[PDB]
C-alpha cells in the first residue's frame, strides 16, 4: 500500500510519526548511533542501521582528496544506508569550524575570536553560508558548528573557538546558524529544527552547557557558577540558536557544580528540551558518554543509561559500535530505558533528517564540487581576517610618525619571522589535521607571498625567518614587518597556563626592531603576555588566527582599507590575574575589552 513517510508532499511531523511506527529496536537503536567513517563499510551500515556517520579531525579518503573524492566517499556510504529496508538515509557531520577545514583546497575562515573582533555579524552570516557551500561540495550534510562557548579564561586550549568572553557579543554572532542553515520562515516556532534544503547544512550550537565556564580553563573540567551566572552568562546564545532554528545541539564534555553536562537531566531534558522547547536532535561529543566515569570508559553499561536518560538522541561512539548498541539493546529488553525515551530520540532525529530534504537529496551533487576553495568564497575570508585584526600600538611615542599604513613602494624591506611564511601556522587548529600543522599544509597565501603581491614591482623583497640584529642592521632596510606567535592547537593540548609565546619569537622581534623600524604580527589564539613584544614593537597587530587568506593582512598593513578590529576579550597584564573578565571587580587590563587602534585608507 502507500508508503506516507516516503511521500515528500507530507508534512514532516507525519512522515516522522508514520516511519517511527514501522520500525524496529534495532532500526531505532541505529539511528541514534554515530560512527567515524574510519569503522565504517558497508555490511556495518546496512547490518546495524546506521543513522549517522562523521570524519572526526584529519579523517579524511586520502591526503589531497578531491572534493569529488569526498562525494564519492559519502555516496557510497549512503548507497548502503538507503539499501536497508527502509532505506532511511545517513547524515554525514564533520567539524566545519572555520570553513570545510578538513579538506585540501577548501576556504581556511579567521578562527571565531578574530571574527568577535570583527563586531560584524552579518560578515559571519556571509562565513556561514560560504561555509554550508564548502561543505555541500564534499557531499558533506552536517557541520558541528557554531562553538557558542564563551570562554571565560584564555588559558583554555578551546579559546580561540569562542567568539569572545562577553556573552553579548557570542550572540549577535549566532548569525553563523542562518548562514550555514538558511533563514527561518517569518511563522518560525523557536526551538524547531530548519535547514533550507540541498545546497545549506544541518548546524549544531556546541557545547552545551558552560564549556568557556572551566576552572583554570581547564579543558573538560567543571564550571564551577551558581545558575544565575550560568544562565547569565553560558546560556542567553542557546536561546539566539533556538530563535535561529539551530537542527542540533552537542553536549560538553565539561561538569556544571561536578555533575557531568553528558549525565545532566535537569539541563538537557528539563531546560534545553522542556523550557527552551528544543526540537532538534541533542548529540554526544567524542566518547563524551565514556567521560561520565573516572576512569573513562570504566563503566560503559552506566555511561549508555546515564547518557540516554539524561536525554541525548545521538551518540557519538564513534569507534565501538557493537558494543554501544549492544548495551542500550540490552537496557531497552531489561524496562531501564523505556520505549518512550527511545522514540523521542528518533523523533528529533528523523525530524531534522525529514526536515533538511535529506530523503530527497540523500546523494552529493556534483555540480556542487566547484565551491570548494571558490574565488569569492577566500576574497569573503580575505575580508573577514582584515576586519578581525586589532591594532594594538602604531608608534613608540605620542610624537613618532604613524608607521602604518606602509608604504608600498620603498627600495627594500625585511619580512622575518617564524609567523611570516607559514600556512599551517598562520591557520592553527582544526585545519587539515585535528591540530592544525605547520607549513604549506593547502592551498593558502602566506604574509610573505601577500607582502610579494602587495608592494609596487621596484620594492625589493627580502625574507629571513630568524635574522641577527647585524643583519638587519646591514640590509638597507625601509622597514620590516616581523610575524611570530602560537604554534597550531586543538583541545586539550591548547591549555597553557603560562601564555607566552614560542621562541624565537621575541627574540626576533627585539632583533629586528633594534635594526629598523617595525609592525609586529602577532598569530594567536587568544591575548599572550605582550609587553616585552609591544617594548620592543613600532607597530604591534593582534592577526589572531587569519585563515588561508594572508593578504587580509597586508590589505591593512599598507592602507588599502583602516584597521577597524577591536578586541574581543579583555588582554591581560599577567597570567595571575586569571580569570579576568570585562565587568569584573578590581578589572586591571593591559588592554581592555573593545580596544583597538584606527588607521584611514591610502
Ligand atoms: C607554557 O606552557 C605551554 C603549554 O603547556 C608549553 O608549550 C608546550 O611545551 C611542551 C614541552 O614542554 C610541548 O610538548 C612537547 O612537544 C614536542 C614537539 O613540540 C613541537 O611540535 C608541536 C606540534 O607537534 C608544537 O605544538 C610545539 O610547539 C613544538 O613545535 C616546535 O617548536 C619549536 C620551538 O618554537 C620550533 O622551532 C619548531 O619549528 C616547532 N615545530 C612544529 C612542528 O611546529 C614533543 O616532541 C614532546 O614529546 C612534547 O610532547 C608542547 O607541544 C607545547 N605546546 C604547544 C601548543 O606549543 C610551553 O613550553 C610553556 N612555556 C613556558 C614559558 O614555560
Ligand atoms: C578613518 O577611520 C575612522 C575610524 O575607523 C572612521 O570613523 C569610523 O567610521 C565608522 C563607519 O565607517 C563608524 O562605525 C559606525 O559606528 C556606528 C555607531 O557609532 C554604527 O551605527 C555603524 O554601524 C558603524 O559601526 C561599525 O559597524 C561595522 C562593525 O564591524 C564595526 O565594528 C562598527 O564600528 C565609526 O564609529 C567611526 N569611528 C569614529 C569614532 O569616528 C572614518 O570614517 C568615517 O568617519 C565617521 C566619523 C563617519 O562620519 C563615517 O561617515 C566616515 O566614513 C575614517 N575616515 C575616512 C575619511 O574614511
Ligand atoms: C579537572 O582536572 C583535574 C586535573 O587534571 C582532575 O583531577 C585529576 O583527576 C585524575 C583522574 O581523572 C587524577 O589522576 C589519577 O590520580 C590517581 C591518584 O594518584 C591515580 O591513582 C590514577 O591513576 C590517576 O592518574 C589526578 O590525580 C587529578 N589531579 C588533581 C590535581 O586533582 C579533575 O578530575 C578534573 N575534574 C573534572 C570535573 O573533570
Ligand atoms: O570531532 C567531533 C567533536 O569532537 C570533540 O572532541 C570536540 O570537542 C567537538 O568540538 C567536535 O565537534
Redesign the pocket.
Known amino acids: 500500500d502507500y508508503v506516507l513517510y516516503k511521500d515528500a508532499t507530507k508534512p514532516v511531523e507525519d512522515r516522522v510519526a508514520d516511519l517511527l511506527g514501522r520500525m524496529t529496536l534495532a532500526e531505532k537503536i541505529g539511528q541514534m548511533t554515530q560512527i567515524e567513517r574510519l569503522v565504517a563499510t558497508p555490511d556495518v551500515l546496512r547490518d546495524n542501521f546506521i543513522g549517522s556517520l562523521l570524519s572526526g579531525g584529519g579523517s579524511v579518503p586520502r591526503k589531497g582528496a578531491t572534493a569529488k573524492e569526498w562525494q564519492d566517499m559519502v555516496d557510497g556510504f549512503q548507497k548502503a544506508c538507503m539499501s536497508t529496508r527502509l532505506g532511511i538515509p545517513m547524515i554525514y557531520g564533520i567539524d566545519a569550524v572555520h570553513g570545510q577545514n578538513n579538506v585540501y583546497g577548501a576556504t581556511i575562515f579567521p578562527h571565531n575570536v578574530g571574527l568577535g573582533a ?3 555579524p552579518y560578515l559571519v552570516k556571509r562565513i556561514g553560508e560560504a561555509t554550508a557551500l564548502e561543505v555541500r561540495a564534499t557531499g558533506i550534510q552536517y557541520a558541528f558548528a557554531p562553538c557558542i562557548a564563551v570562554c571565560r579564561d584564555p588559558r583554555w586550549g578551546r579559546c580561540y573557538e569562542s567568539y569572545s568572553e562577553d556573552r553579548r557579543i557570542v550572540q549577535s554572532m549566532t548569525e553563523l546558524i542562518p548562514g550555514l542553515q538558511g533563514d527561518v520562515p517569518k511563522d518560525f516556532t523557536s526551538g524547531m529544527p530548519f535547514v533550507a534544503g540541498k545546497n545549506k547544512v544541518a548546524a549544531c550550537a556546541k557545547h552545551f552547557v558552560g564549556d568557556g565556564g572551566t576552572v583554570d580553563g581547564i579543558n573538560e573540567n567543571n564550571t564551577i557558577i551558581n545558575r544565575e551566572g550560568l544562565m547569565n552568562i553560558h546560556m542567553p546564545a542557546y536561546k539566539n540558536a533556538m530563535d535561529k532554528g539551530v537542527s542540533t545541539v552537542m553536549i560538553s564534555y565539561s561538569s556544571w557544580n561536578g555533575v557531568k553536562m553528558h549525565a545532566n537531566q535537569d539541563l538537557v531534558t528539563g531546560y534545553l528540551k522542556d523550557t527552551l522547547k528544543f526540537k532538534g536532535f541533542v548529540i554526544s561529543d567524542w566518547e563524551g558518554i565514556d567521560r561520565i566515569t573516572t576512569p573513562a570508559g570504566s563503566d560503559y553499561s552506566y555511561s549508555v543509561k546515564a547518557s540516554i536518560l539524561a536525554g541525548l538522541d545521538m551518540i557519538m561512539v564513534p569507534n565501538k559500535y557493537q558494543q554501544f548498541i549492544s548495551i542500550l539493546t540490552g537496557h531497552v529488553n531489561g524496562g531501564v530505558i523505556p520505549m518512550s525515551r527511545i522514540d523521542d530520540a528518533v523523533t528529533r532525529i528523523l525530524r531534522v533528517k525529514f526536515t533538511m530534504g535529506l530523503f530527497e537529496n540523500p546523494y552529493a551533487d556534483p555540480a556542487m564540487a566547484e565551491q570548494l576553495g571558490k574565488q569569492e568564497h577566500r576574497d569573503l575570508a580575505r575580508e573577514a581576517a582584515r ?1 578581525s585584526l586589532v591594532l594594538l600600538k602604531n608608534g613608540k611615542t605620542s610624537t613618532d610618525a604613524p608607521l602604518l599604513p606602509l608604504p608600498k613602494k620603498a627600495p627594500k624591506i625585511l619580512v622575518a619571522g617564524s609567523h611570516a611564511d607559514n600556512l599551517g601556522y598562520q591557520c592553527g587548529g582544526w585545519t587539515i589535521e585535528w591540530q592544525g600543522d605547520t607549513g604549506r599544509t593547502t592551498v593558502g597565501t602566506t604574509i610573505l607571498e601577500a607582502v610579494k603581491a602587495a608592494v609596487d614591482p621596484s620594492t625589493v623583497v627580502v625574507f629571513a625567518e630568524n635574522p641577527d640584529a647585524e643583519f638587519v642592521k646591514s640590509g638597507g632596510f625601509s622597514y620590516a614587518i616581523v610575524a611570530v606567535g602560537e604554534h597550531p592547537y586543538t583541545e586539550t593540548k591548547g591549555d597553557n597556563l603560562n601564555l607566552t609565546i614560542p621562541e624565537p619569537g621575541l627574540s626576533t622581534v627585539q632583533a629586528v626592531c633594534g635594526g629598523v623600524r617595525c609592525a609586529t604580527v602577532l598569530i594567536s589564539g587568544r591575548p599572550v603576555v605582550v609587553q616585552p613584544l609591544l617594548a620592543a614593537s613600532d607597530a604591534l597587530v593582534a592577526a589572531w588566527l587569519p585563515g588561508s587568506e594572508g593578504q587580509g593582512v597586508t590589505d591593512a598593513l599598507f592602507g588599502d582599507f ?1 584597521f ?1 578590529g ?1 578586541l574581543p576579550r579583555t588582554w591581560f597584564k599577567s597570567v595571575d590575574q586569571l580569570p579576568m573578565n570585562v565587568g569584573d571587580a578590581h578589572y586591571d587590563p593591559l588592554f581592555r575589552l573593545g580596544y583597538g587602534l ?1 588607521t ?2 591610502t
Open positions: 570583527t563586531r560584524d576586519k583602516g577597524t577591536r584606527t584611514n585608507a
